[PDB]
Amino acid sequence: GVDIRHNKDRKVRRKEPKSQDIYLRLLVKLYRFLARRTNSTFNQVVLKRLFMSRTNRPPLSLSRMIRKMKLPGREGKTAVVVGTITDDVRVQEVPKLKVCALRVSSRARSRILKAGGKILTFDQLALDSPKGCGTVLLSGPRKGREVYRHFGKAPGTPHSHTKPYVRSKGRKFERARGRRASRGYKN
Amino acid sequence: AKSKNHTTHNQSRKWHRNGIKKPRSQRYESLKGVDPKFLRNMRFAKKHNKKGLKKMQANNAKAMAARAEAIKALV
Amino acid sequence: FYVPAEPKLAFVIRIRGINGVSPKVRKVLQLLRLRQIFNGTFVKLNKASINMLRIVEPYIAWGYPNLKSVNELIYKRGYGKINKKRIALTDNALIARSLGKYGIICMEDLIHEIYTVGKRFKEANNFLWPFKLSSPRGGMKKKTTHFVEGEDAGNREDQINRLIRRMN
Amino acid sequence: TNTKGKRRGTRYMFSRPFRKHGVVPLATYMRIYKKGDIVDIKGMGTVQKGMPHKCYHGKTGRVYNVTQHAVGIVVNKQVKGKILAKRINVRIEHIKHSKSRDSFLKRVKENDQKKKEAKEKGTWVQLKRQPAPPREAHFVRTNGKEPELLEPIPYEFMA
Amino acid sequence: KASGTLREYKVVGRCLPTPKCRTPPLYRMRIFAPNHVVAKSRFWYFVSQLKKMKKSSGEIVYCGQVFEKSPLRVKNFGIWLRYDSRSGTHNMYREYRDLTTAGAVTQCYRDMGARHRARAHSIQIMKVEEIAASKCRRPAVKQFHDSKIKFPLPHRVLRRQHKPRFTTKRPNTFF
RNA sequence: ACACGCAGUUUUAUCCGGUAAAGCGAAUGAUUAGAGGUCUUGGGGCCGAAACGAUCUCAACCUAUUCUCAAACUUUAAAUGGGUAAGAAGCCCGGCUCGCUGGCGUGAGCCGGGCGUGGAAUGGAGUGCCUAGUGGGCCACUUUUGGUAAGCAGAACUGGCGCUGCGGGAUGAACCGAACGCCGGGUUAAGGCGCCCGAUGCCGACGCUCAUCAGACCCCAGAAAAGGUGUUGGUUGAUAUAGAGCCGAAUCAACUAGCCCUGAAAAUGGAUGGCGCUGGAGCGUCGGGCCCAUACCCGGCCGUCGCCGGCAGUCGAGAGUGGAC
RNA sequence: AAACCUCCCGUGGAGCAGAAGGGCAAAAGCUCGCUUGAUCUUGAUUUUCAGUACGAAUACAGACCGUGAAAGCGGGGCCUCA
RNA sequence: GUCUACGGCCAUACCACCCUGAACGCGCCCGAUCUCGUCUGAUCUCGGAAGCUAAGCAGGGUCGGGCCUGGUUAGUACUUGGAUGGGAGACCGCCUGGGAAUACCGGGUGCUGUAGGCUU
Ligand SMILES: [Mg+2]
Ligand SMILES: [Mg+2]
Ligand SMILES: [Mg+2]
Ligand SMILES: [Mg+2]
């Protein structure tokens, strides 16, 4: 008889990708070997992000990647993204960059190749930089999805700015008793 | 059909099951709830911090030079 | 008269189960690495530890161990906590790998640190997994009452050695 | 059931002690309370304005706001599931400095002194506190006189 | 408190020294206990009952067993008792005949438990003194004060009733 | 070979309370009785036309005492308990900003620089989404309200049953021990060792007790006041060789505590579990030895969890190099 | 014995509208003189709390004021409900 | 040694009675034209320096009351945790720790900040 709680003994973190596509499985096997053998933690982070779901690796915009590469010191380094590189249309000047990503949009691929940059896959990254030396690891905005605007403190609560679940926004659908000082009260 | 009115018998176990937490203290607490005049003065002070920045830069450079000279004198 | 020094080392054995335990008593017991019955551990004696042992007097039986007691406990039932795993101390290599930075390289150093509590008593004691002692051979006197009144619970300053011999 | 009155059950809590009624001493009115000062709240029945609630009596908090004759204190309060760090406005008469932090400040200053000193000496000094150790075995000298016997006293009914 | 074959312990203790009282006085007591661990507890109980001294505020200076000076001589021991009944407490004086003082105290405990249903925790031992043949009040002790003492064993009920259990001969009680 | 942060814990400091207790010779309220008071006035009365002239008495009061109380009283005042602090988000300097406050000053906010184990012991932590069932409870130690009481109704803390098997209490919700994968060996807890029924088939120890209603183990399954020279101990008090007519050595009285006895009456035949037990198999205090639970220790097997686990094929056990030239 | 005047003692044993508790003595009581802060407007917080409303309250701030020599005090009732 | 003005802690500072006050100072005290307010220059306000410690005030004394601080009460009352402890219960003892309050008996009877005087 030993008094130990078993409610938090099984950890919930992912061990393998839930997708059944085979190319991702091959990349997972390659980076499993690299992470379990090489002492580099970059391979561990890449493996963990490869295990992640669609919402856990949001797409990275071209403008954000350019701005991140604009920082001093990280010049002539390979961009590593485990998500998708998406074209940004409200930017004009695109420099030459070395990018590694699972997916690159056709517009983004064309603009990157036009500027003289290079686009590589993760199997090419393993051949080029097996330990991930001289690379900048980036990711998209995790809180970019519209679901997080509905998360947090409940609406109708003081000092809360959470979007309620409404069928349609309008004059007579909300903003009444509970939100108007003239109608009962407001929070 | 009278029933039980009120009790607090099993509540302590429920409270202590999910690790009753001291509120999470975070650095740089918010300024909500402070008198408006003091906040207005602080905002005006921060608004003009950029003014006279070259004086701060020159003083910092002079202090750095003095510190380097003192380090060299010590060595 | 020569008043001997207050002992700095104590050995604590939990002598009752895990049913119907007070929250404070169970908190003290789990802070002492004593969760299963008949588990033993070494406790460094000071004001805070003395009060903690006073809280859980009915649940523990403790005393002042000898050199032979610590020798047998560390040798026969000595297990080290390596990588959060219970590993038997079958070689000095494990003890060195764990406590080399503290000058502990052999079981003799562990015995010296435990019996003669020094600067690194905390790390050496925490390295040792809590002892899994067997049931006391020859039976007990009375589990439910204090040692002063003929029972087993409480402080048995010199008589803890007999209990160790009958349990180890 | 009990009423929801604000001052219910404060018959003795918000009451001046024996032979200490009358004019409030002026020392409490002229003590400063900077931001980040640890303060323990004790209500006073003489002043009715700025009265803290009965649940904050005896609690200790930190000052975050200051007004002309009142300060804002953040005090932890447990409500049946958790501890809430909530801010209240309390007048000065119900506010006094807490002496728990001054001992720590004094020990910090002493430790800084012991760090600056004995550094060129080379001998490291013990800065951490320790609990009460064993009683440092010694000798007891019963010079001449023998120990006195203490026999139990026979019982007798006194009532 | 339990009882076994008790031993006599001499316990010396004092309150912890203080700047107000640099040299506190030393106190000693006669404690009959199965072991020294419970002897210290009984000493502290009695001292706290008499003086303003507690275990935390004091210390044990010397604890040691008192050996019988003449184990080979038969002596008469007078014991003054202080025990609690179902009703109020009472004071008693009892006499026992034994070779050792500790044996006399054990006999006193056994006799008190047998005759008055009094447990050990309810009994306080005040004074134990050896007495000569005279000054004995109890005739049970006095009847053995005879140089030419004679008595046979009239009814010797045999033991070993379960040593070989079935026998053709009935036992004998006259020897 | 290399730890931040958190705790139904304690320690060292520093605040909070008004319950237990105690007091009413201190406040409020209740309340007993004597001494000194025409303090004050008044009723019956007695010596007096009357008279504070003598004597008491009953009225509410006083002066120093005295007996007893308060959940809705209190000068005092615990144990238990409730907040904080035990450092990097901390200190020590230099300089800027301010439509705030100010005689100079404050106060706050911005930048630059220098100083790291901050009491004990134990834990890896933090954070975000969906989310079923539940929303009749009950019992027990302790505190406690109403009621004569209740296996009654109603509260506080903790632990259980509910949702839980196992050993013991013969029987069994909640009691004692102890919590569950399938097994072998050993040892225990609580309980026991005349037979049922495993184990005292000890050459057990010391005492008590006779019941024509004996007694025999928390919950628990039954008894009170009052009595007994029945018996066994303790306390106090006297007298007795100056003798408690004869015999002759110790004697009496009042209390007190154990066992037993009277008090002690209900309905189918009846239950220390039964048989039975009295040099106990009863009662009190106690020694060894022994009996076994799914508990503990060692070992085999099954599964789950964790290993920043290992293997795409290499040197290698405190790793603290290897290799050109 | 109780009409009004004078002196002394008087820790509040009075009064503060109400039920009770707390608090108050050159007051928070009584008498006077002036007034309508019982005015207009953003927020923050406290009580029950789910930490939602209503009511009640607490510190502020921005204007118009009242009062006093001034410091200051006052955006209803000394506070706990109406 | 001490006083005045403004204070801090608010009786070790209060209350009752008695004795002593050298100098400065604090007041009593002398009047109501001007300022001011009353039934009354009693209070307040104003104008002064003929007398005084009479009083306030300051210091000291009371086998003083009170107040503050100790011993006793007392390891008593009470109380955390424990028992298959006792008892029909009411209740009580023990183990492990903490630990009171009356009556009664001792000691003491204001310290101190700023500025300005006197004793030169
Ligand atoms: Mg249990
Ligand atoms: Mg009481
Ligand atoms: Mg159900
Ligand atoms: Mg305003």
Give me the amino acid identity at A22: I
Read off the amino acid at residue A182.
Answer: S
**Cβ neighbours of B21 in D, within 8 Å:** 82-83
Q: Got the DSSP string for E82-119?
A: EEE-SSSEEEEEEEEEESSHHHHHHHHHHHHHHHH---
> Distance between CA C43 and CA C40 in Å, rounded?
10
| D76 class by beta-carbon count within 10 Å (0-12 exposed, 13-18 middle, 19+ buried) | middle
Best probe of the D interface among E42, E48, E126, E129, by most D CBs < 10 A, is E126
Residues E50, E7: Cα–Cα separation, whole Å: 23
8 A C-beta contact, residue D73 and residue D63: yes
Residue type, E5: T
Q: How far is the CA of D19 from the C1' of H61 (A)?
A: 29
Strand H reaches within 7 A of the E42 CB: yes
* Three-point CA angle D123, D124, D125, nearest 5°: 115
Q: Kindly tell me the burial class for residue C62, based on how many C-beta atoms sit within 10 Å of its own C-beta (0-12, 13-18, 19 or more).
A: buried
Residue E172, C-beta contacts closer than 8 angstroms, at least 6 positions apart? E158
* Distance of E24 CA from H69 C1′ (whole Å): 25
Return the residue matching tokens 């002692």. C133
If residue D149 lies in a helix (H) or strand (E), which one and from where to where? Answer: strand D148-149
Are the CB atoms for A125 and A80 separated by under 8 Å?
A: yes
Rounded to the nearest angstrom, the distance between the alpha carbon of B41 and the centre of ligand 4 is 19
Residue ranges with strand state E in chain C: 9-14, 39-44, 60-63, 79-82, 85-88, 131-132, 154-155
CA of D88 to the centre of ligand 4 (A): 21
Chain A residues touching C23 at Cβ < 8 A: none
**Look-up of token digits 């309810």:** E122
Q: Which two tokens stand for residue A116?
A: 């003289």
Q: Tell me the residue ranges of DSSP E strands in chain B.
A: none
Q: DSSP readout, C102-143?
A: GT--SHHHHHHHHHTT-TTHHHHHHHBPPEE--PPTT--S-T
C127 φ, ψ (degrees, to nearest 5): -65, -35
Q: What is the 3-state secondary structure (H, E, C) of chain A?
A: CCCCCCCCCCCCCCCCCCCCCHHHHHHHHHHHHHHHHCCCHHHHHHHHHHHCCCCCCCCEEHHHHHHHHCCCCCCCCEEEECCEEECCCCCCCCCCCEEECCEECHHHHHHHHHCCCEEECHHHHHHHCCCCCCEEEECCCHHHCHHHHHCCCCCCCCCCCCCCCCCCCCCCCCCCCECCCCCCCEC
Question: C140: Cβ under 7 Å from strand F?
Answer: yes
- Three-state SS at C2: strand
Q: Is D35 near chain B, with CB under 8 Å?
A: no
Length of chain B measured in residues: 75
Question: Amino acid identity, residue C23?
Answer: P
Enclosing H/E stretch for E38: helix E36-50
Stated resolution in angstroms: 2.8
> In this complex, how many residue pairs, one in chain C and one in chain E, have their CB atoms less than 8 Å apart?
24
| E53 beta carbon to strand H: under 7 Å | yes
C37/A3 Cβ within 8 A = no
**Closest by CA position to C20, among listed B8, D80, A1, A7:** A1
Proximity of residue D45 CB to strand G below 7 A: yes
Distance CA C10, CA B70 (A): 56
CA–CA gap between residue E54 and residue E157 (Å, rounded): 54
Which 8-state DSSP code applies to residue C5? P
- Under a CB-based contact definition with an 8 Å cutoff, are residues D98 and D40 in contact? yes
Distance in angstroms, CA of D16 to C1' of G23?
9
Q: How far apart are CA C138 and CA E93, in angstroms?
A: 40
Q: Do chains A and E touch (3 or more CB pairs under 8 A)?
A: no
Helix H or strand E segment including E129: strand E123-131
Give the rounded distance of the alpha carbon of B71 from its chain centre: 34
**G27 C1' – D45 CA distance, angstroms?**
15
DSSP E15: E
Rg (alpha carbons) of chain D, rounded to whole number: 26
Instruction: Output the six-digit token pair for B30.
Output: 């918010």
* Torsion (CA) C63, C68, C71, C77 in degrees, nearest 10: -70
Q: In what side-by-side order are the strands of the sheet with A60-61?
A: A60-61, A84-86, A103-104
Contacts of B20 in chain D (CB under 8 A): 81-83
How far does chain B reach from its first CA to its final CA, in angstroms? Answer: 92
Contact indicator for C9, C42 with CB cutoff of 8 Å: yes
Place of tokens 């983004």: A108
Q: Which residues of A are annotated as a binding site for Mg(2+)?
A: 7
Interface probe with E: pick from C148, C149, C158, most Cβ of E within 10 Å: C148
Looking at residue D73, the DSSP 8-state letter turns out to be E
Cα(B5) to centroid(ligand 3), Å: 19
- What is the number of alpha carbons within 13 Å of residue A83 lying toward its C-beta? 20
Which helix (H) or strand (E) segment holds residue C92: the answer is: helix C92-99
Sign, CA dihedral E115-E117-E119-E125, equals: negative
Q: Give the burial class of E112: count Cβ atoms within 10 A of its Cβ; 0-12 exposed, 13-18 middle, 19 or more buried.
A: buried
Residue D129, CB, less than 7 Å from strand G? no
**What whole-number distance in Å separates Cα of residue A187 and Cα of residue A154?**
11
Residue in C1, C158, C159 nearest the CB of E62: C1
Q: Nearest nucleotide (C1') to the CA of residue C50?
A: F10
Q: Which of A81-111 are b and which e, b meaning 16 or more Cβ less than 10 Å from the residue's Cβ?
A: bbbbbbbbeeeeebeebbbbbbebbeebbeb
Q: Are E43 and E8 in contact (CB under 8 A)?
A: no
Per residue in B10-45, is it b (16+ CB within 10 Å) or e — as a string? eeeeeeeeeeeeeeeeeeeeeeeebeeeeeeeeeee
Q: Which residue from A123, A82, A90 is spatially nearest to A107, judged by alpha carbons? A: A90
In chain E, what residues touch C150 (CB-CB under 8 Å)? 1-2
Helix spans in B7-52 (H): 11-17, 36-47
